Amino acid sequence: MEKVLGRLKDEEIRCRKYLHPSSYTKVIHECQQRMVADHLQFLHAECHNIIRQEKKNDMANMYVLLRAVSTGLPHMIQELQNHIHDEGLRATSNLTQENMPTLFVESVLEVHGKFVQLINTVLNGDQHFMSALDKALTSVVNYREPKSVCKAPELLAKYCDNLLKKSAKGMTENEVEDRLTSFITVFKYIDDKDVFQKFYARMLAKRLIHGLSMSMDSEEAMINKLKQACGYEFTSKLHRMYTDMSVSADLNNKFNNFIKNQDTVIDLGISFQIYVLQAGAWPLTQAPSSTFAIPQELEKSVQMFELFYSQHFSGRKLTWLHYLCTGEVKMNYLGKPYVAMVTTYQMAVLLAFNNSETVSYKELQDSTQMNEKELTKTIKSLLDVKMINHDSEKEDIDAESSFSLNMNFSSKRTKFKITTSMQKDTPQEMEQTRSAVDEDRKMYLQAAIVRIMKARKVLRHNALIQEVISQSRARFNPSISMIKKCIEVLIDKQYIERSQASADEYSYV
Amino acid sequence: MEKVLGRLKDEEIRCRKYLHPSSYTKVIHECQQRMVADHLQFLHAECHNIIRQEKKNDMANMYVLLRAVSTGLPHMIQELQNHIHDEGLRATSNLTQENMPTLFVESVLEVHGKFVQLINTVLNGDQHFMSALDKALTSVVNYREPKSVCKAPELLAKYCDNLLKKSAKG
Amino acid sequence: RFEVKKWNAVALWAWDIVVDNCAICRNHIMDLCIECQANQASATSEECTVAWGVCNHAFHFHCISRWLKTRQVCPLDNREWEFQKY
Numbered sequence: 123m124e125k126v127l128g129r130l131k132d133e134e135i136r137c138r139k140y141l142h143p144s145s146y147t148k149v150i151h152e153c154q155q156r157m158v159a160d161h162l163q164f165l166h167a168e169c170h171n172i173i174r175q176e177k178k179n180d181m182a183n184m185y186v187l188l189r190a191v192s193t194g195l196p197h198m199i200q201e202l203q204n205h206i207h208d209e210g211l212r213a214t215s216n217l218t219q220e221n222m223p224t225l226f227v228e229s230v231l232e233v234h235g236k237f238v239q240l241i242n243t244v245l246n247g248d249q250h251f252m253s254a255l256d257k258a259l260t261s262v263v264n265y266r267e268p269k270s271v272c273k274a275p276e277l278l279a280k281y282c283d284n285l286l287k288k289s290a291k292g293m294t295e296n297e298v299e300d301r302l303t304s305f306i307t308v309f310k311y312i313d314d315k316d317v318f319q320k321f322y323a324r325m326l327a328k329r330l331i332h333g334l335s336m337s338m339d340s341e342e343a344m345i346n347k348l349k350q351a352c353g354y355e356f357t358s359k360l361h362r363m364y365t366d367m368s369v370s371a372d373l374n375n376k377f378n379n380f381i382k383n384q385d386t387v388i389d390l391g392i393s394f395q396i397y398v399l400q401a402g403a404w405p406l407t408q409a410p411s412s413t414f415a416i417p418q419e420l421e422k423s424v425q426m427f428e429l430f431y432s433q434h435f436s437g438r439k440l441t442w443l444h445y446l447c448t449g450e451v452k453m454n455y456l457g458k459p460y461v462a463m464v465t466t467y468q469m470a471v472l473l474a475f476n477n478s479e480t481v482s483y484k485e486l487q488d489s490t491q492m493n494e495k496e497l498t499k500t501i502k503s504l505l506d507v508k509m510i511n512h513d514s515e516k517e518d519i520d521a522e523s524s525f526s527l528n529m530n531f532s533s534k535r536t537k538f539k540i541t542t543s544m545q546k547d548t549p550q551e552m553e554q555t556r557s558a559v560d561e562d563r564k565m566y567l568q569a570a571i572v573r574i575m576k577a578r579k580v581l582r583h584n585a586l587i588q589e590v591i592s593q594s595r596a597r598f599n600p601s602i603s604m605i606k607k608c609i610e611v612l613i614d615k616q617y618i619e620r621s622q623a624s625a626d627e628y629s630y631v
Numbered sequence: 632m633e634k635v636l637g638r639l640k641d642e643e644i645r646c647r648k649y650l651h652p653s654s655y656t657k658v659i660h661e662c663q664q665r666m667v668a669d670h671l672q673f674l675h676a677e678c679h680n681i682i683r684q685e686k687k688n689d690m691a692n693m694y695v696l697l698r699a700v701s702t703g704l705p706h707m708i709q710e711l712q713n714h715i716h717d718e719g720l721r722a723t724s725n726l727t728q729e730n731m732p733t734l735f736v737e738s739v740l741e742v743h744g745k746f747v748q749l750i751n752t753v754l755n756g757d758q759h760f761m762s763a764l765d766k767a768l769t770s771v772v773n774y775r776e777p778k779s780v781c782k783a784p785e786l787l788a789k790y791c792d793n794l795l796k797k798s799a800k801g
Numbered sequence: 802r803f804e805v806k807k808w809n810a811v812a813l814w815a816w817d818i819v820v821d822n823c824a825i826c827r828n829h830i831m832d833l834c835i836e837c838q839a840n841q842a843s844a845t846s847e848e849c850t851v852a853w854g855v856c857n858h859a860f861h862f863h864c865i866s867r868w869l870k871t872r873q874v875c876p877l878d879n880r881e882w883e884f885q886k887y
């Protein structure tokens with residue numbers, strides 16, 4: 123390599139000082155096509171060794187010579203892509219479960235930064251090599267275990283949730299901003315952005331409703347960065363969520379002005395402050411369809427707010443949510459030791475205890491009208507925090523379930539919180555999120571399929587697969603089974619049909 | 632409509648293995664004239680609730696039923712057009728003046744992007760429906776303030792200028 | 802005795818427009834408005850016209866009249882309200 127570059131420089135200055143100016147390119151071309159292109163096999167054979175060894179100057183000279191060759195460069199591109207892929211696998215698959223998201227993103231950032239620095243310095247920043255690096259890192263972060271899972275979107279969502287949540291560890295605003303700006307580089311190669319979008323929507327709901335965000339400006343900056351990463355259709359739901367959480371303050375002010383401008387004194391008796399959210403863009407849902415009974419002292423406020431939202435807004439039914447609802451309660455029954463934050467599910471049975479110390483499961487059922495599962499969950503949560511004690515022989519759930527209040531509660535905290543389901547992340551709800559993602563994937567695939575068929579009405583199976591892969595490449599990587607299921611669904615709805623002459627070709631219904 | 636489609640699909644099967652092949656159309660056509668074409672007043676009345684809440688399952692079953700009857704579609708075309716025109720107006724408006732062009736073009740495109748993605752999966756890109764979408768977005772793009780001039784051409788002028796200007800933001 | 806102090810709750814709102822219905826009175830457009838539903842003896846049942854905006858939306862005239870005294874924006878779609886019909 124050294125001799126070839128030195129002799130090439132000598133020949134360049136020689137032909138420049140001797141020949142006509144119009145022949146310099148031809149002299150160089152014949153001085154390389156018969157010098158390194160004839161010995162291209164040896165250089166290609168040594169290319170993998172020279173890439174893996176990561177010797178700087180020799181790699182730079184090899185890149186110069188292979189760029190001189192018309193068909194000498196792609197082998198080096200493949201060798202470098204394979205090296206980066208192997209380095210990423212050995213730098214990511216060895217990670218532990220003690221802290222997977224933060225360390226995973228840090229390792230991907232370190233590998234990406236080192237390779238970008240190397241490409242910019244000793245590789246002239248070729249776009250072919252940058253594309254090879256992007257493909258290699260895409261294969262690295264999507265280290266899908268065989269036919270089981272894909273942990274990259276969940277890990278990145280957990281990373282964003284960990285860094286943006288108000289934590290006592292301590293992270294300043296500007297550090298959060300630059301860390302997220304670096305994070306977008308990692309997110310730009312996921313090829314599974316739907317799962318990350320849904321997981322980030324869930325974590326944004328959990329953070330915003332409980333007020334765990336350190337600053338709304340951080341959330342807006344993160345949402346803007348995501349919008350610049352993918353597009354508005356990627357972040358429309360998130361932006362609507364943030365807009366609703368911002369305008370919640372104005373809505374509370376308008377509600378307070380409305381209840382201070384009424385003819386009579388409402389006298390709600392509580393520190394009411396609502397979090398009205400749009401039903402169309404929040405990942406919450408009324409899956410627990412169990413009927414809940416609002417306590418009367420809150421029933422007055424619910425009726426007043428329902429009237430307000432029917433007056434100062436129109437055509438908006440107000441689907442109340444309770445399993446996100448929570449608030450503070452006082453306990454001066456036993457001497458007022460502290461004030462307890464409590465979800466309204468447990469607040470209902472607390473008011474039932476306030477009605478009478480001796481209460482059975484049937485009384486809770488007729489006072490709250492809620493299902494057995496949610497009532498059992500609230501009861502076990504109360505006894506797990508030792509709020510109440512089971513008077514039965516066994517402490518688990520039973521048909522009778524006769525118990526009263528535990529008077530031994532003397533917790534030191536003056537604002538002790540009995541609810542801690544801020545993380546949750548049950549595998550059942552994660553599987554539900556995966557199923558919703560799969561349903562959106564099926565919708566997108568059906569949209570692309572019907573659009574293509576309306577465009578041409580005659581395509582084979584392989585072309586359909588290729589165009590579905592290409593068009594949906596910015597969202598996910600669809601499987602053959604998913605596309606077959608979608609085309610079978612369109613068969614079932616008498617929307618699509620295969621050709622009678624050949625099953626490869628399809629038709630229109 | 633779920634039970635109708637169960638009967639209509641069965642009636643194609645039942646007439647297939649029982650009757651002459653030349654009477655397949657006449658049995659199904661008279662089936663529709665007693666099950667879906669005699670309840671146009673009922674189906675169009677409940678068509679309004681289907682489109683507004685965007686029930687993908689029921690909208691698909693309404694489309695296959697109302698396609699058979701001659702007059703079934705033109706009321707649903709008017710209903711979806713009224714829904715898109717309403718759904719467009721929410722997206723275009725309530726926008727801050729700091730980033731009016733980029734938010735406006737994104738919001739109309741997002742409504743167009745979602746509803747094209749909804750027509751194809753449910754209504755199968757019916758050209759009658761695509762005209763209803765294009766008519767509806769024409770009203771929402773060219774929407775006008777009271778005693779003012781339409782702000783659509785100026786707003787897209789700034790958007791294509793912002794997109795093409797030398798900007799360091801990616 | 803138990804006393805509740807804070808009830809910071811979450812409410813979901815979705816569009817609930819039903820056909821030929823006043824978005825404010827939550828009843829049929831052709832009937833009287835809920836403001837004129839009471840004291841029907843005083844109401845002549847003729848002044849409750851169906852006001853139509855430029856967005857092809859139907860309210861009672863009294864309803865949109867009371868609406869305009871606070872805001873000049875249509876409740877159904879967040880645009881400025883312009884009458885076109887009577």
Ligand SMILES: [Zn+2]
Pocket residue numbers: 823824825826827833834835860861864
């Ligand atoms: Zn009214």
Ligand SMILES: [Zn+2]
Pocket residue numbers: 833834835836837838848849861863
């Ligand atoms: Zn009236």
Ligand SMILES: [Zn+2]
Pocket residue numbers: 854856857858875876877878
């Ligand atoms: Zn309107």
